[PDB]
Design a protein around this motif. Structure first.
Motif, PDB file in Angstrom:
ATOM      1  N   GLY A  79      59.121  96.759 100.047  1.00 36.30           N
ATOM      2  CA  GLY A  79      60.198  97.334  99.280  1.00 36.30           C
ATOM      3  C   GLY A  79      60.268  96.878  97.847  1.00 36.30           C
ATOM      4  N   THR A  80      61.333  97.283  97.179  1.00 38.30           N
ATOM      5  CA  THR A  80      61.534  97.050  95.760  1.00 38.30           C
ATOM      6  C   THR A  80      62.722  96.144  95.517  1.00 38.30           C
ATOM      7  OG1 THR A  80      62.882  99.038  95.593  1.00 38.30           O
ATOM      8  CG2 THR A  80      60.533  99.254  95.186  1.00 38.30           C
ATOM      9  N   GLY A  81      63.842  96.442  96.157  1.00 37.87           N
ATOM     10  CA  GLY A  81      65.098  95.766  95.925  1.00 37.87           C
ATOM     11  C   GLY A  81      66.152  96.698  95.404  1.00 37.87           C
ATOM     12  N   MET A  82      65.788  97.948  95.133  1.00 34.81           N
ATOM     13  CA  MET A  82      66.799  98.938  94.829  1.00 34.81           C
ATOM     14  C   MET A  82      67.427  99.490  96.094  1.00 34.81           C
ATOM     15  SD  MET A  82      67.293  99.580  91.588  1.00 34.81           S
ATOM     16  CE  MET A  82      67.849 101.270  91.510  1.00 34.81           C
ATOM     17  N   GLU A  83      66.696  99.453  97.218  1.00 34.42           N
ATOM     18  CA  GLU A  83      67.176 100.109  98.431  1.00 34.42           C
ATOM     19  C   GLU A  83      68.557  99.630  98.819  1.00 34.42           C
ATOM     20  OE1 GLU A  83      63.661  99.456  98.883  1.00 34.42           O
ATOM     21  OE2 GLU A  83      64.009  97.367  98.354  1.00 34.42           O
ATOM     22  N   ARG A  84      68.863  98.375  98.533  1.00 37.59           N
ATOM     23  CA  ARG A  84      70.196  97.895  98.827  1.00 37.59           C
ATOM     24  C   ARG A  84      71.197  98.619  97.943  1.00 37.59           C
ATOM     25  NH1 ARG A  84      72.991  93.407 101.100  1.00 37.59           N
ATOM     26  NH2 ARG A  84      71.467  93.216 102.804  1.00 37.59           N
TER      27      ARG A  84
ATOM     28  N   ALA B 197      71.724 102.367  98.777  1.00 37.65           N
ATOM     29  CA  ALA B 197      72.500 102.538  99.995  1.00 37.65           C
ATOM     30  C   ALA B 197      73.978 102.366  99.702  1.00 37.65           C
ATOM     31  CB  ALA B 197      72.038 101.542 101.057  1.00 37.65           C
ATOM     32  N   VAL B 198      74.322 101.301  98.995  1.00 32.21           N
ATOM     33  CA  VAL B 198      75.723 100.980  98.786  1.00 32.21           C
ATOM     34  C   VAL B 198      76.365 101.949  97.807  1.00 32.21           C
ATOM     35  CG1 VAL B 198      77.281  99.278  97.872  1.00 32.21           C
ATOM     36  CG2 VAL B 198      75.416  98.570  99.379  1.00 32.21           C
ATOM     37  N   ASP B 199      75.740 102.158  96.644  1.00 32.22           N
ATOM     38  CA  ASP B 199      76.355 103.004  95.623  1.00 32.22           C
ATOM     39  C   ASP B 199      76.604 104.411  96.138  1.00 32.22           C
ATOM     40  OD1 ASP B 199      76.055 100.820  94.006  1.00 32.22           O
ATOM     41  OD2 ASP B 199      74.960 101.891  92.436  1.00 32.22           O
TER      42      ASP B 199
ATOM     43  N   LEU C   7      80.003  97.036 105.738  1.00 30.71           N
ATOM     44  CA  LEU C   7      80.652  97.041 107.038  1.00 30.71           C
ATOM     45  C   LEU C   7      79.918  97.887 108.065  1.00 30.71           C
ATOM     46  CD1 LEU C   7      83.110  95.782 108.201  1.00 30.71           C
ATOM     47  CD2 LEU C   7      82.814  95.493 105.773  1.00 30.71           C
ATOM     48  N   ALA C   8      79.458  99.068 107.680  1.00 31.20           N
ATOM     49  CA  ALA C   8      78.764  99.912 108.630  1.00 31.20           C
ATOM     50  C   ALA C   8      77.662 100.666 107.916  1.00 31.20           C
ATOM     51  CB  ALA C   8      79.729 100.873 109.304  1.00 31.20           C
ATOM     52  N   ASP C   9      76.516 100.778 108.569  1.00 34.63           N
ATOM     53  CA  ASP C   9      75.438 101.537 107.977  1.00 34.63           C
ATOM     54  C   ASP C   9      75.709 103.008 108.182  1.00 34.63           C
ATOM     55  OD1 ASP C   9      73.895  99.290 107.166  1.00 34.63           O
ATOM     56  OD2 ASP C   9      73.044  99.132 109.185  1.00 34.63           O
ATOM     57  N   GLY C  10      75.172 103.809 107.275  1.00 35.37           N
ATOM     58  CA  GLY C  10      75.217 105.242 107.387  1.00 35.37           C
ATOM     59  C   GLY C  10      73.930 105.720 108.007  1.00 35.37           C
ATOM     60  N   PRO C  11      73.652 107.001 107.886  1.00 41.86           N
ATOM     61  CA  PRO C  11      72.362 107.490 108.353  1.00 41.86           C
ATOM     62  C   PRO C  11      71.289 106.975 107.424  1.00 41.86           C
ATOM     63  CG  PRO C  11      73.468 109.199 107.135  1.00 41.86           C
ATOM     64  CD  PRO C  11      74.449 108.047 107.238  1.00 41.86           C
ATOM     65  N   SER C  12      70.183 106.548 108.012  1.00 45.00           N
ATOM     66  CA  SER C  12      69.024 106.102 107.250  1.00 45.00           C
ATOM     67  C   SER C  12      69.350 104.909 106.353  1.00 45.00           C
ATOM     68  CB  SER C  12      68.477 107.266 106.427  1.00 45.00           C
ATOM     69  OG  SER C  12      67.410 107.894 107.107  1.00 45.00           O
ATOM     70  N   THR C  13      70.179 103.997 106.851  1.00 45.07           N
ATOM     71  CA  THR C  13      70.427 102.736 106.173  1.00 45.07           C
ATOM     72  C   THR C  13      70.472 101.651 107.225  1.00 45.07           C
ATOM     73  OG1 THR C  13      72.794 103.099 106.290  1.00 45.07           O
ATOM     74  CG2 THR C  13      71.694 103.628 104.240  1.00 45.07           C
ATOM     75  N   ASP C  14      69.866 100.515 106.919  1.00 45.38           N
ATOM     76  CA  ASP C  14      69.789  99.411 107.860  1.00 45.38           C
ATOM     77  C   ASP C  14      70.296  98.130 107.228  1.00 45.38           C
ATOM     78  OD1 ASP C  14      68.419  98.272 110.561  1.00 45.38           O
ATOM     79  OD2 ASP C  14      68.198  96.891 108.868  1.00 45.38           O
ATOM     80  N   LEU C  15      71.388  97.605 107.778  1.00 45.28           N
ATOM     81  CA  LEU C  15      71.965  96.335 107.353  1.00 45.28           C
ATOM     82  C   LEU C  15      72.148  96.245 105.844  1.00 45.28           C
ATOM     83  CD1 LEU C  15      70.767  93.395 109.504  1.00 45.28           C
ATOM     84  CD2 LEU C  15      72.952  94.609 109.419  1.00 45.28           C
ATOM     85  N   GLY C  16      72.503  97.361 105.231  1.00 44.82           N
ATOM     86  CA  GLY C  16      72.782  97.402 103.818  1.00 44.82           C
ATOM     87  C   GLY C  16      71.631  97.831 102.942  1.00 44.82           C
ATOM     88  N   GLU C  17      70.433  97.985 103.490  1.00 49.98           N
ATOM     89  CA  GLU C  17      69.306  98.463 102.710  1.00 49.98           C
ATOM     90  C   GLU C  17      69.134  99.950 102.994  1.00 49.98           C
ATOM     91  OE1 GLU C  17      66.486  94.574 101.942  1.00 49.98           O
ATOM     92  OE2 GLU C  17      66.454  95.433 103.967  1.00 49.98           O
ATOM     93  N   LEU C  18      68.199 100.585 102.307  1.00 54.27           N
ATOM     94  CA  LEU C  18      67.999 102.025 102.425  1.00 54.27           C
ATOM     95  C   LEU C  18      66.709 102.264 103.172  1.00 54.27           C
ATOM     96  CD1 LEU C  18      68.734 104.943 101.675  1.00 54.27           C
ATOM     97  CD2 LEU C  18      67.215 104.617  99.749  1.00 54.27           C
ATOM     98  N   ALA C  19      66.815 102.766 104.382  1.00 55.47           N
ATOM     99  CA  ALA C  19      65.638 103.079 105.170  1.00 55.47           C
ATOM    100  C   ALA C  19      65.495 104.574 105.356  1.00 55.47           C
ATOM    101  CB  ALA C  19      65.717 102.384 106.521  1.00 55.47           C
ATOM    102  N   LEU C  20      64.526 105.162 104.671  1.00 55.22           N
ATOM    103  CA  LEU C  20      64.330 106.598 104.746  1.00 55.22           C
ATOM    104  C   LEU C  20      63.332 106.958 105.816  1.00 55.22           C
ATOM    105  CD1 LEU C  20      64.035 105.540 101.549  1.00 55.22           C
ATOM    106  CD2 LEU C  20      64.647 107.928 101.230  1.00 55.22           C
TER     107      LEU C  20
END
Lengths: 51, 50, 50, 50, 214, 100, 227
Positions: free
Chosen positions: F5-10, F13-15, F87-100
């Motif tokens: 990864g890069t470090g933007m995925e977090r 996901a959040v923004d 608090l909660a992941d959305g679709p395609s997000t894992d523990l605060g990061e962005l998993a596509l």
């Protein structure tokens, strides 16, 4: 109903019966070519690499 | 940096290993690169286009 | 027509004054029903399910 | 591409490889040499051909 | 937990040496598991009678030419690796080939022995040119299991009957199943074993090894 | 999760609102697959009404592209959470990061 | 044509083990090891949960009030529950539990043939003092991979809308590896060994497995030996 017996009947109408395949930018006459159909499970068309 | 992490990994620096065909069970000439790539499923899925 | 009339005559079916528009699942797609909504004109009586 | 990369790797020769210098009656027993693991795919060899 | 068995096996002969047999109902991946396990034992471990040690008439080393024959010593040996024979009660028999006069020296000109069976009497050993052309050799033939090349052994042991084996797994359609595979085993032999016999005895040794696990 | 990864995925996901971010920090009082109730810390809490922050999670529902957008709780019963934590992941997000 | 036989079978963990076959001739270690890997990884007996009817759940896409796992996620957890039966080809297990805490795989109702190889296996958690989950877990036995999709053809009125189906995972084997090392018996030219390092969920014993594997093997060769 897709009764099981119909698939064998399809093998008859398919055997010797060419189908036309075509791609999006047809340029020369090879853009359409005839093939003999082979029944394949799955939703994808399989195409001989040499073509 | 990557090669050093592979040292800590126990895995070769080349990033390539020996692989065996599951059919004949015989080896593969030359090492091949194996690793972990992130892969996406785009939505063109075949049972739409068809 | 004549032969359809004989067909109903033999098999004694009353051909309805209503034609079937019912919504049926599109060909090939298969799934589970997760929800149903009923919108009704204001003034028409809501049916049982609604 | 893949097909021609196969044939390129097939008919090619390195300097020293298993079976170098030997002679065989014909292509049939040539494959028998290779598939069994005795001879390398590319090694300089005289064989009778028709 | 029932297990699917094959059916239909039409056997198409190609002459008398080789043939292409076919097996329709093989489950997933079993075409390779069988086709490969049989290819393995066919090319490698098989009973065979080939030629190994050759002591010739006048010239002892392989680097020369025998006067009266247009074939280099190396080229005649290759012909020997392809002489197909079978014995019965002997594990090695030493024959004797003699001939003279202008003409080809074939495989029927040898000295017949009780256990000697030459499957190709027309097999060309070498020619015999101008004059009378002297030729006699005591040919030491042994018996074994597999292909033993002269290097590890002075000719290469050809004992295997089999020459070329190929298996192709094509998709077999059972009436109500997705994809099953077929097995096309195209084999090749020196004629000292019939194709149908071999593939039986091949698998025979196979299952015979399983005898401690059945 | 992306393994490389890069470090933007977090940040992505959040923004993006797909996930559910803590309004105020505290300890989780109640965790359900439906909602999440956080008992606010007093330093972060306003004097009146006391309070707790109740997050009603989005459940399985149709997206514009007909995909599934569903939130899952990423925290466990009675765990300290700080303001601005996932608090909660959305679709395609894992523990605060962005998993596509 | 000297034939092999088995030898020391070394259990290491409840998961995996290294079995060994001592008397293999030249190259026969490979001829089997690959041919054996094939049937081991693919066709083996297994019992995986199939139909699950839960308390108040209409479909796999809802959420039960009082448990933090989505129903879909709980079904997937079941696909990974390892069990073994003896005399039944399908048994329906009744799972009940309540109270705040993890609901593990040891909280089910024991049966004469029920052996839970991972009692700690997490089925789902429970987030409220009084919240109770009842489920009928129908476990059957079979071979291969049967996905839940191909199951709805027979159907024939599986009307229990509360009976939610999952995908059939049937197989003990996880990872199979074979290594052929040269085995030196006191007198013989050269012989080889077979080290088969396999990996399992613990629902099949090593000696049992390798037999039915080789069993099917010779059983397919039956036709082969003639025409």
């Amino acid at each position: 109903r897709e009764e099981a017996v119909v698939w064998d009947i399809l093998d008859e109408v398919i055997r010797e019966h060419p189908v036309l395949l075509n791609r999006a930018p047809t340029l020369h006459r090879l853009g359409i070519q005839a093939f003999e159909p082979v029944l394949i499970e799955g939703k994808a068309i399989q195409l001989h690499p040499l073509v | 940096e990557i090669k050093e992490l592979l040292k800590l990994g126990d895995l070769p620096t080349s990033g390539q290993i020996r692989l065996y065909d599951g059919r004949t069970g015989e080896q593969f000439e030359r090492p091949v690169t194996v690793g972990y790539m992130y892969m996406l499923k785009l939505n063109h899925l075949v049972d739409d286009k068809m | 027509t004549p032969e359809e009339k004989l067909l109903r005559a033999i098999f004694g079916e009353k051909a309805s004054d209503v034609k079937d528009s019912s919504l049926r699942v599109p060909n090939g797609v298969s799934g589970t029903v997760i929800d149903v909504q009923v919108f009704t004109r204001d003034g028409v009586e809501k049916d049982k399910r609604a | 591409q893949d097909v021609v990369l196969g044939l390129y790797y097939m008919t090619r020769d390195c300097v020293n490889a298993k079976g170098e210098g030997m002679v065989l009656t014909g292509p049939k027993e040539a494959e028998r040499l290779y598939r069994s693991g005795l001879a390398s795919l590319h090694a300089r060899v005289k064989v009778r051909i028709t | 937990t029932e297990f699917l068995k094959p059916r239909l096996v039409d056997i198409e002969q190609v002459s008398s040496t080789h043939a292409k047999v076919t097996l329709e109902p093989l489950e997933r991946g079993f075409g390779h598991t069988l086709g490969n396990a049989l290819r393995r034992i066919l090319l490698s471990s098989m009973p065979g009678c080939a030629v190994t040690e050759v002591e010739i008439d006048g010239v002892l080393h392989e680097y020369s030419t025998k006067e009266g024959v247009q074939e280099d010593i190396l080229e005649i040996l290759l012909n020997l690796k392809g002489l197909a024979v079978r014995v019965q009660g002997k594990d090695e028999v030493i024959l004797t080939l003699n001939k003279s006069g202008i003409g080809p020296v074939t495989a029927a000109d040898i000295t017949h022995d009780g256990d000697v069976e030459i499957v190709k009497p027309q097999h060309v050993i070498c020619h015999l040119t101008d004059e009378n052309a002297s030729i006699s050799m005591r040919i030491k033939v042994q018996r074994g299991r597999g292909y033993v090349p002269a290097s590890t052994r002075l000719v290469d042991a050809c004992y295997s009957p089999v020459e070329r084996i190929a298996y192709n797994v094509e998709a077999a359609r059972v009436e109500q199943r997705t994809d099953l595979d077929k097995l096309v085993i195209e084999m090749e032999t020196n004629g000292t074993i019939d194709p149908e016999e071999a593939i039986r005895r091949a698998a025979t040794i196979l299952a015979e090894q399983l005898e401690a696990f059945v | 999760k992306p393994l490389v990864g890069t470090g933007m995925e977090r940040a992505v996901a959040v923004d993006s609102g797909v996930t559910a971010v803590a309004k105020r920090g505290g300890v989780v009082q109640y965790v359900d697959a439906s909602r999440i109730v956080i008992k606010v810390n007093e330093d972060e809490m306003y004097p009146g009404e006391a309070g707790i922050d109740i997050y009603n999670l989005t459940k399985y529902t149709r997206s514009n592209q007909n995909t599934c957008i569903n939130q899952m709780p990423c925290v466990s019963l009675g765990e300290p959470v700080e303001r601005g934590d996932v608090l909660a992941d959305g679709p395609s997000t894992d523990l605060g990061e962005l998993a596509l």
